[PDB]
Symmetry: D2
Subunit: 467 residues, 4 copies
């Protein structure tokens, strides 16, 4: 009922023209946005609503059955052209929002779709100029959240000196929020999976994020960060927190983020002997991009040791998880697109089935298709006591639509906190400093393969049984 | 390869002509019997193989495709007419077995299909004359195994003075052998269901045996025994033992039967305040037998307080099952045919879902439609943390064919032992003595109903949460 | 070194002249204070160091051997006479503080020994004038912390608007700091008491605080608060938190206080059916104060329903403590002085000792005669398997000296936090408002007795097995 | 009443004159034997009561105060001189037994104190002639119980063909029966030690039997057997069974020996890579026997590889003990005399005390100075969270007197069964056969030392944390 404003900062960027404008399209088309919602794209280059429409519609997946809606949404939008570090431009933007139907009373939601190098200014000029004194103000901030503990600490200190945690929404583009809630209901609403979610029963946890494509085109941007900062420090660590957290006092966002930050506090810094770093190389037998390696892109500087694959073993050192490995295995240009949580359970204490039993597994897959199944063992039909392994299933805006919708709803559970991000960077900072100090060479692996075999050796070493 | 002889004692009885002869039919037709297996019916009335064939074919459920095979089976059988308590008849029977291809070397398997009041004689004669000096000798003993602890004790003492436990096969017609193996593999090969199979997680165990029909025709025979001796003292108690047993040292029959008797040794005698007894009356509404009550059967003595339904709460007083109710609910002329094991689990400690979660259940239904499924809370598809109860499935000669096969293969695991039967009668003897001494009146319940509501009240009292 | 100042706000009060001045005297005498420490009393009435000495020496409990040291102590003291709500007086106090050896560089430690109704002013003035720009500033705040959730929230919001949690030290005079550390090392450094510290094994927790004396003289001050605010809302609740808290991420003060507030968050509001309130009356027989009841004290208003005894059952509704009662039993004019934690464990699952076993107990007695002992079953010497109950022991400035030392050392673990106090008041606020709205009459109990019998009945009802 | 006869078979042997006659002395003197108990020595050499008295009194340890009672005892005894394999002598012994006050009605208790090579004869004759038709008959059998599985099976089959298990009492001279009851009451009457008694908490179990002396003169008798048959196959294995057994259905002897044999059934055969064997050699620095080695004894055959020390790691492959080492360390000529059960517990999951905690231990020392104590971490008195290890104590005819009393009382709990002995020999037979086939050389260790260092290395390898 309350009027809302959606201010897309840096609306001329690729992220705005390809992923955010289509997302608010899909939210308004499905009737999920509040009825009184305005979309104010603000950027430097001078554009109009017609220009935004022309440059963004290809990604709208538009259909002729709903072109009428394609007008209404675009009658709800507006554009402001101004520099990111000019107070007059932000004054014009604030006046423009005020020059709307109940714009002063509206709840303002700033989606920062602009390079992080100018977050410091953009988050600053917002506070004095474009804030709302009646409705709430919320900023959505995109990664990179710095690159070290120090850089992230200074950026977070700036944003927290200006805004509060109730106004900061650090977004994770790879968080399903549907398999996350599936995890929470599975392990917290059920006594089947309650007592077994600890050291005594779980042997290892595997947290996977594989991509079948390399770093085509935008390989230079990936070079300065690496796969640990790109996927592992932020996403896989949040998945680890969700897997390993204790039951919160309630389903409140703060009560869940407290458990997650506690899990992060129980994790120590990463040692280089628990890390396998790999880099993908061209595949002579490939067809398309598979024949070109990471260093074959003309945008990647020569002799770059940036890892496109990482397998890292972590240990949550508390009463529930002491000694249980957490293998974060992420990679680009791998064989498949996969993102899942895998728990092997220990072998049953005392085998009366003649070593025919395999470790039970609980798999919560998020990509490509969501699923929740258990690999247990059932009696093989026949005349005999010989068990056989069976996979038993235990289980629609996509992940990104439901994440922008959380910022509207104020559900800040699935966004990383400031102390949470601080612990996340504390865990990985010494290892990253060592990596870009000594400059070790990552293991080369073929495009489309499963990654370096040293990763498999490391998982086997830490206690992972593969059939 | 070894030659076998199958001696059907009392082959003229209804049990042999309707259940045993068709079963050896289906075992030979399916190629499951050993190739050199002879069938020797033995009874009082002068009959021939042709007479047995005439009395047996309607229940054989044969087809024209295998009628030639029929001849083979009926070229394989033989008949002996002799009194059950005459040594000359048993000498003739032993000579007749000796007058077969390798009859002296054959393994002899006696199925005692004759009234229990004659057992004490027949077994004696079997030991005197018809035993085999080369191959093994095995007797299949049919229930009733006495009426109480004293009668069962004397019968078992006689049979054990003659034969050993390796030769005694006390058969349970209602035991699946298929879903029992599912139980054992599920709870002993899987770590998912291992740690949760105890006091801490399981709230109650419900062992059910319902029949939708009454005691038509043969109601007088049921009158002298009652539903406790009919279904509960023998079958449901074995199901209880299988559910509650510790993991055996191996899958050997003796190692499993030791756990069964150990479970029985820690069940106290049944108290009448944990027992609800009912008797079915006619559903006037109508149907067929539904309109005839238990006492409306002319063969049932007038003023009979025999219970056709019983709900009994037991407690396995040991480290794993202290305080966990075991509700044996058995009944005739109930609403449905059902035989299942139901484990409710405790409510999750700490409910963050606003009392929306329901107790998890593990259901192992043996008949009809064998199934193994868990009712647990899954995330309701949508937008919020809403748990909803969902039923997730975790899962061929019939039970009787696979039980006669056990005596051939020597798998004695699914047959009750002498000490196991002694404990089974020890548990129920005081209650049965009280019932047939005081003669309480069972609660009348409508034919086709769910039984007396006092059973539901008793389960609610002992800790059964019904939704 | 790092010169310190100890500012006793309200040094003319009874608390300063009887408990605070002797405590800092014993801390300086024992060589526990930092060498460069000044004690600056500040009050309204015009006094001097000689007057403070005259009013303080009888409570100093000094000896002629160390009298010279006493002189040294009084060489480090000074006095300032100024009103509590006068900015000029605080300017003079700050100037006097600066007029010391490195007074500007000194770490200032304010002990607020003045009535709570003045706190709102004093803290303000302390923030305006008497802050230190170089060293740290710490305030020690005495109870009462308000009368309910609203008053405590007001005072806490004021103090937190001025000071931060690193500067607020809310003192608990009844907390040992000695047996708390024994409790933490017992349940966190030992695997003997780790796994058993939960629902599965612990039947109930009893937290006791008894005083053998009544409310002599100062009965009017106790009238406006009651035993729930006096001892139960603040002290016994912190003992509950220490008993029930999860293992912290470290021994840091914040990591422990986080677990304590997490335990508080999962305790529901108190219901009047879980509360037994009592008032002590004259033990006629008596001898001294025992002959005078609570209402016989002339300063107590007539017809006062203030409870001098309370037995309250709480439930920590989380995974570790769901369903386990926590009986806080506190009282004045009871039979003995006692303050202990008592855990009964559950009965052993499966009794092979013919019901001769009693529930195991773990007792952590804080005063008098600090002890840790388990009551378990040991084999009675002789020829037989008959266990007998045996008490086995598992186990220096007093508590108050070690608490003032914490504020110097910065160990803020044993002081209540703002959110901790908020949850503590949230638990008890509805019950207290109901008590002072309906005005129920507490059960009268004899001076020197064990309390009302309804408390024993309530413990027996909730699951306390007293042998 | 129920007059008793105590038949010492082989009363002229050293075991009778040094251990048995003094034991029945101490049993009769203490008023522990039944009043009408007769002692009948039976041997080959022609002796009288006076000769037995002369060879017995020096070991009786008598005092002048009770010398009168002495004649009573020697007025109670009798002697029969007859060959061990002569039916006429046994008929004479039976007639002499009948030639006593109510000798025919007496309960006969035969203590076989004669070389094992004669057992097969003696028992036979005992069954033919000397049995009692009215009272019970009980034979006490002494180790060796064969040399391996085959010999023990032969002897046990013979004795079980003659006697039943209710009549066989296989004696263990090293079993306390006082600290065994302490074990059972400790771990079965207490919830403190119940849940923690498993894989999740116990790291290793150490069962020790050290002797400070070596084979003095009877090294020839020890040579044919070795320390595995002498102390480990029989005594330490029973200690293992008592430590590892599940809770019996009752304190009945059969219910306890069932759990013991069930524990034995889930122990695999011993592998030579889990065995360290040692032989003691003379110590130049010794004074008495310490300077003579095992091979320095003229009775020991030259080049004897008999192990006087053994450290063997076993694994009870069941639900409660899978993967938990059971280190049986036994030895002769070691540093001290000791026999204890030691349980180390696992390190606490999550150390908040900076690697200062040591593994908790539960020690049940049987000799010398019987004790039960736990080593756990207690808070070191002071100002600090640093724990220190502390030893907390949790705790009369000698063991042999209480064992002969058990045979009188019919308590067969602490004697090894036929199937128990069969499993015990099954575990150790392959290893002993390998030892006698390959003839490995044991590690030489100094007399009075702690044993070979390879034993310490083996324990460290299997998971024993020594501080």
């Amino acid at each position: 009922s309350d009027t809302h404003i959606f201010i897309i900062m840096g609306a001329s960027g690729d992220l705005a023209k390809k992923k955010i404008y289509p997302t608010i399209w899909w939210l308004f088309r499905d009737g999920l946005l509040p009825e009184n919602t305005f979309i104010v794209g603000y950027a430097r280059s001078r554009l109009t609503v017609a220009d935004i429409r022309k440059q963004s519609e290809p990604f709208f997946k538009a259909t002729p059955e709903e072109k009428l809606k394609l007008e209404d949404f675009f009658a709800r939008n507006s554009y402001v052209a101004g520099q990111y570090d000019d107070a007059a431009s932000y004054q014009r933007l604030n006046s423009h929002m005020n020059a709307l139907h109940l714009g002063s009373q509206a709840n303002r939601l700033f989606y920062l779709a602009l390079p992080p190098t100018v977050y410091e200014a953009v988050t600053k000029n917002i506070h004095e100029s474009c804030m709302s004194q009646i409705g709430w103000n919320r900023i959505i901030v995109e990664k990179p959240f710095g690159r070290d503990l120090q850089s992230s600490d200074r950026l977070s200190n700036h944003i927290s000196s200006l805004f509060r945690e109730d106004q900061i929404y650090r977004i994770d583009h790879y968080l399903g929020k549907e398999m996350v809630q599936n995890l929470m209901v599975l392990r917290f609403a059920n006594r089947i999976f309650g007592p077994i979610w600890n050291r005594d029963n779980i042997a290892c946890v595997i947290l996977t994020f594989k991509e079948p494509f390399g770093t085509e085109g935008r390989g230079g941007y990936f070079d300065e960060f690496g796969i640990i900062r790109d996927v592992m420090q932020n996403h896989l660590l949040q998945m680890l927190c969700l897997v390993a957290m204790e039951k919160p006092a309630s389903t409140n966002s703060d009560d869940v983020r407290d458990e997650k930050v506690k899990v992060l506090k129980c994790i120590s810094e990463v040692q280089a002997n628990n890390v396998v770093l790999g880099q993908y190389v061209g595949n002579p037998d490939g067809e398309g991009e598979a024949t070109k390696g990471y260093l074959d892109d003309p945008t990647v500087p020569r002799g770059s040791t940036t890892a496109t694959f990482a397998a890292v073993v972590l240990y949550v050192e508390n009463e529930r998880w002491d000694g249980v490995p957490f293998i974060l295995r992420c990679g680009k240009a791998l064989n498949e697109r996969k993102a899942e949580v895998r728990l092997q359970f220990h072998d049953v204490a005392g085998d009366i089935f003649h070593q025919q039993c395999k470790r039970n597994e609980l798999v919560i897959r998020v990509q490509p298709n969501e699923a929740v199944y258990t690999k247990m063992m059932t009696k093989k039909p026949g005349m005999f006591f010989n068990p056989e392994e069976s996979e038993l299933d235990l289980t629609l805006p996509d992940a990104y639509e439901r994440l922008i919708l959380d910022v509207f709803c104020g559900s800040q559970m699935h966004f990383v906190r400031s102390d949470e991000l601080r612990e996340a960077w504390r865990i990985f900072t010494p290892l990253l400093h060592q990596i870009e100090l000594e400059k070790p060479k990552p293991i080369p692996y073929i495009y489309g393969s499963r990654g370096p075999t040293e990763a498999d050796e490391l998982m086997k070493r830490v206690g992972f049984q593969y059939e």
